[PDB]
Every structure is written in structure tokens, then in C-alpha cells.
Amino acid sequence: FSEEQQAIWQKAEPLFGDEPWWVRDLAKETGTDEQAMRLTLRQAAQQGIITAIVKDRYYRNDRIVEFANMIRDLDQECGSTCAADFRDRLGVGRKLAIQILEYFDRIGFTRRRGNDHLLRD
RNA sequence: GGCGGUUGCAGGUCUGCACCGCC
Ligand SMILES: [Ca+2]
Ligand SMILES: [Ca+2]
Ligand SMILES: [Ca+2]
Ligand SMILES: [Cl-]
Ligand SMILES: [Cl-]
Ligand SMILES: [Mg+2]
Ligand SMILES: [Mg+2]
Ligand SMILES: [Mg+2]
Ligand SMILES: [Mg+2]
Ligand SMILES: [Mg+2]
Ligand SMILES: [Mg+2]
Ligand SMILES: [Mg+2]
Ligand SMILES: [Mg+2]
Ligand SMILES: [Mg+2]
Ligand SMILES: [Mg+2]
Ligand SMILES: [Mg+2]
Ligand SMILES: [Mg+2]
Ligand SMILES: [Mg+2]
Ligand SMILES: [Mg+2]
Ligand SMILES: [Mg+2]
Ligand SMILES: [Mg+2]
Ligand SMILES: [Mg+2]
Ligand code: NA
């Protein structure tokens, strides 16, 4: 973190609860230039503090670990995790549910086969 | 009706519907 990036992070940081954040919303909320916020969160993600599931949409890393354990729970009730079941269980729209699931697919946590996300590890 | 929107909801996925913007 530069000095400008450290001042906007102390701003952005308390706002990271259980919900994901778009860069642009973080920026509107803390009175910071959108692009300046974009670079600060990218460095926050290089540190290992927050993870972008899609470009500019971030969760705290411990939130990700909880989602990974929800996939383990559903895998064991159903035999696998599909979009519809995950978004039912999360209580969120299907679009965020698929963003999260496709995140895990591309880190190799799960693999997609048809509608299912199968535990890979 | 056309073109759009890091909008929402759905269905595996780039479309439908809704809402907004410009015509
Ligand atoms: Ca894990
Ligand atoms: Ca299933
Ligand atoms: Ca499995
Ligand atoms: Cl959430
Ligand atoms: Cl990623
Ligand atoms: Mg939502
Ligand atoms: Mg629903
Ligand atoms: Mg909603
Ligand atoms: Mg999606
Ligand atoms: Mg497939
Ligand atoms: Mg019309
Ligand atoms: Mg459009
Ligand atoms: Mg937005
Ligand atoms: Mg767009
Ligand atoms: Mg949309
Ligand atoms: Mg919009
Ligand atoms: Mg379909
Ligand atoms: Mg496809
Ligand atoms: Mg397309
Ligand atoms: Mg429509
Ligand atoms: Mg109307
Ligand atoms: Mg109107
Ligand atoms: Na939990």
C-alpha cells in the first residue's frame, strides 16, 4: 500500500462484512475516486485480505471460506452443488450464486460438469 | 421498435422478463 492507498483502505476496510462489494460502491460510500479505490483493493487482494469473485466485486476472505463450507454441506445432502440449490441455500439471487460458484471452479475447489459443481480439491 | 446499463429476477449463459438511460 502507498500512502494514498493506506488512507482509503482504513476507509473501505470497516465496510467489509458478509456482503460483496463493487469497487464503485466502495468508492461512492467513502468519498474516493473510483479508480483510486480499484487500485487500493487490487493491492488488498494481493495481500490476501479480500478476493474478487469477478473483476471489481470483492468478498473478505473468511466470507469465501464460509461459502466453501456451504458447498461441502450441499455436496453431502445432494451429491453435488448446482446453481439453484446454492442460491436457495445462500438466500441470494442466482447471479451472485453463479459468480461465487464459478470462482471456486476456476481455483480448482470444484469443477463444473453440466449443472453440477463437483468437489475437486 | 432501435441501441445501451459493472441494475434486479429467472433458466446454465446469453437470452427472457422487469426496471433505468438515450432515441
Ligand atoms: Ca477450504
Ligand atoms: Ca443436485
Ligand atoms: Ca462431488
Ligand atoms: Cl452474500
Ligand atoms: Cl478469480
Ligand atoms: Mg444481492
Ligand atoms: Mg428465486
Ligand atoms: Mg434482490
Ligand atoms: Mg453470473
Ligand atoms: Mg457444461
Ligand atoms: Mg418500446
Ligand atoms: Mg441491454
Ligand atoms: Mg453497479
Ligand atoms: Mg454492463
Ligand atoms: Mg442484469
Ligand atoms: Mg444501471
Ligand atoms: Mg435455459
Ligand atoms: Mg455454456
Ligand atoms: Mg453474447
Ligand atoms: Mg424486455
Ligand atoms: Mg413502467
Ligand atoms: Mg418512468
Ligand atoms: Na455458516
Coordinates of C-alpha atoms (C1' of nucleotides) and ligand atoms in Angstrom, one line a residue:
Chain A
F1 CA 0.0 0.0 0.0
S2 CA 1.2 3.5 -1.0
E3 CA 0.3 6.3 1.5
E4 CA -2.8 7.3 -0.6
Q5 CA -3.9 3.6 -0.7
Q6 CA -3.4 3.2 3.0
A7 CA -5.7 6.2 3.7
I8 CA -8.5 4.8 1.5
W9 CA -8.2 1.3 2.8
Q10 CA -8.7 2.4 6.5
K11 CA -11.9 3.9 5.0
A12 CA -13.0 0.9 2.9
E13 CA -12.0 -1.8 5.4
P14 CA -14.8 -1.5 8.2
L15 CA -17.4 -1.7 5.4
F16 CA -16.4 -5.4 4.6
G17 CA -19.0 -7.5 6.4
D18 CA -20.8 -10.5 5.0
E19 CA -21.9 -8.9 1.7
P20 CA -19.8 -8.5 -1.5
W21 CA -18.7 -5.0 -2.6
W22 CA -18.3 -3.4 -6.0
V23 CA -15.3 -1.0 -6.3
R24 CA -17.7 1.7 -7.5
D25 CA -19.9 1.3 -4.5
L26 CA -17.0 1.3 -2.1
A27 CA -15.8 4.5 -3.8
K28 CA -19.3 6.2 -3.6
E29 CA -19.6 5.3 0.1
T30 CA -16.1 6.6 1.3
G31 CA -15.9 9.7 -1.0
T32 CA -12.9 8.2 -3.0
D33 CA -12.2 8.3 -6.8
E34 CA -13.4 5.0 -8.3
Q35 CA -10.0 4.1 -10.0
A36 CA -8.0 5.0 -6.9
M37 CA -10.3 2.6 -5.0
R38 CA -9.8 0.0 -7.8
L39 CA -6.0 0.0 -7.2
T40 CA -6.2 0.0 -3.5
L41 CA -8.5 -3.1 -3.4
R42 CA -6.3 -4.9 -6.0
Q43 CA -3.3 -4.4 -3.6
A44 CA -5.7 -5.5 -0.7
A45 CA -6.2 -8.7 -2.8
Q46 CA -2.5 -9.2 -3.5
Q47 CA -2.0 -9.2 0.3
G48 CA -4.6 -12.0 0.8
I49 CA -7.2 -9.8 2.7
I50 CA -10.1 -9.7 0.2
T51 CA -10.9 -11.8 -3.0
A52 CA -12.6 -10.6 -6.3
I53 CA -15.1 -13.3 -7.4
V54 CA -15.4 -11.3 -10.7
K55 CA -13.4 -8.1 -11.7
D56 CA -14.3 -5.3 -9.2
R57 CA -16.6 -7.4 -6.8
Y58 CA -14.9 -8.4 -3.6
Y59 CA -15.5 -10.5 -0.6
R60 CA -13.5 -10.7 2.7
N61 CA -11.5 -14.0 2.5
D62 CA -13.2 -15.5 5.6
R63 CA -16.5 -15.0 3.9
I64 CA -15.2 -17.1 0.9
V65 CA -14.2 -19.9 3.4
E66 CA -17.9 -20.0 4.7
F67 CA -19.2 -20.3 1.1
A68 CA -16.7 -23.1 0.6
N69 CA -18.2 -24.9 3.6
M70 CA -21.8 -24.4 2.3
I71 CA -20.6 -26.2 -0.9
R72 CA -19.4 -29.0 1.3
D73 CA -22.8 -29.2 3.1
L74 CA -24.8 -29.2 -0.1
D75 CA -22.4 -31.7 -1.7
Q76 CA -23.3 -34.0 1.1
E77 CA -27.1 -33.6 1.1
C78 CA -27.4 -33.7 -2.7
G79 CA -24.2 -35.4 -4.0
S80 CA -23.3 -32.1 -5.7
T81 CA -23.9 -28.4 -5.8
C82 CA -25.9 -26.7 -8.6
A83 CA -26.8 -23.0 -9.0
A84 CA -30.4 -23.3 -8.0
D85 CA -29.7 -25.2 -4.8
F86 CA -26.7 -22.9 -3.9
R87 CA -28.8 -19.7 -4.4
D88 CA -31.7 -21.2 -2.3
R89 CA -29.3 -22.0 0.5
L90 CA -27.5 -18.7 0.4
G91 CA -30.7 -16.7 0.2
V92 CA -29.4 -14.6 -2.7
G93 CA -30.1 -14.0 -6.4
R94 CA -28.8 -16.7 -8.8
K95 CA -26.3 -14.3 -10.5
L96 CA -24.2 -13.8 -7.3
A97 CA -24.6 -17.6 -6.6
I98 CA -23.0 -18.4 -10.1
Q99 CA -20.3 -15.7 -9.6
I100 CA -19.3 -17.4 -6.4
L101 CA -19.5 -20.9 -7.8
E102 CA -17.6 -20.1 -10.9
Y103 CA -14.9 -18.5 -8.7
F104 CA -14.4 -21.9 -6.9
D105 CA -14.4 -23.7 -10.3
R106 CA -11.5 -21.7 -11.5
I107 CA -9.4 -22.0 -8.4
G108 CA -9.9 -25.8 -8.6
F109 CA -12.0 -26.1 -5.5
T110 CA -14.9 -27.5 -7.6
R111 CA -15.3 -28.5 -11.3
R112 CA -18.3 -27.9 -13.5
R113 CA -20.0 -30.8 -15.2
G114 CA -23.3 -29.9 -16.6
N115 CA -25.4 -28.1 -13.9
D116 CA -23.3 -29.5 -11.1
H117 CA -20.2 -28.2 -9.3
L118 CA -18.4 -31.3 -8.1
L119 CA -15.8 -31.2 -5.3
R120 CA -12.4 -31.4 -6.9
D121 CA -9.9 -30.0 -4.2
Chain B
rG1 C1' -39.5 -0.6 -32.2
rG2 C1' -33.6 0.6 -32.1
rC3 C1' -29.1 1.0 -29.0
rG4 C1' -27.4 0.9 -24.3
rG5 C1' -26.8 -0.4 -18.3
rU6 C1' -20.1 -3.3 -13.9
rU7 C1' -29.3 -2.7 -12.2
rG8 C1' -32.8 -6.8 -10.5
rC9 C1' -35.2 -11.8 -11.1
rA10 C1' -35.1 -16.5 -13.8
rG11 C1' -33.2 -20.6 -16.7
rG12 C1' -26.7 -22.8 -17.1
rU13 C1' -25.3 -18.3 -20.1
rC14 C1' -26.6 -15.1 -23.1
rU15 C1' -31.2 -14.9 -23.8
rG16 C1' -36.4 -13.9 -21.4
rC17 C1' -38.9 -10.8 -18.2
rA18 C1' -38.7 -6.2 -15.1
rC19 C1' -36.6 -1.5 -14.2
rC20 C1' -33.5 2.7 -15.8
rG21 C1' -30.9 5.8 -19.7
rC22 C1' -30.7 7.8 -24.9
rC23 C1' -33.8 7.8 -29.5
Ligands
CA1 CA -11.2 -24.9 2.4
CA2 CA -28.4 -31.9 -7.1
CA3 CA -18.6 -34.3 -5.5
CL4 CL -23.7 -12.6 0.5
CL5 CL -10.6 -15.3 -9.6
MG6 MG -27.8 -9.4 -3.9
MG7 MG -35.6 -17.1 -6.6
MG8 MG -32.7 -8.9 -4.6
MG9 MG -23.5 -15.0 -13.3
MG10 MG -21.3 -27.5 -19.2
MG11 MG -40.9 0.1 -26.9
MG12 MG -29.1 -4.1 -22.7
MG13 MG -23.2 -1.3 -10.1
MG14 MG -22.6 -3.6 -18.4
MG15 MG -28.7 -7.9 -15.3
MG16 MG -27.9 0.6 -14.3
MG17 MG -32.5 -22.3 -20.4
MG18 MG -22.3 -22.7 -21.9
MG19 MG -23.0 -12.9 -26.1
MG20 MG -37.5 -6.9 -22.0
MG21 MG -43.3 1.3 -16.2
MG22 MG -40.7 6.2 -16.0
NA23 NA -22.1 -21.0 8.1

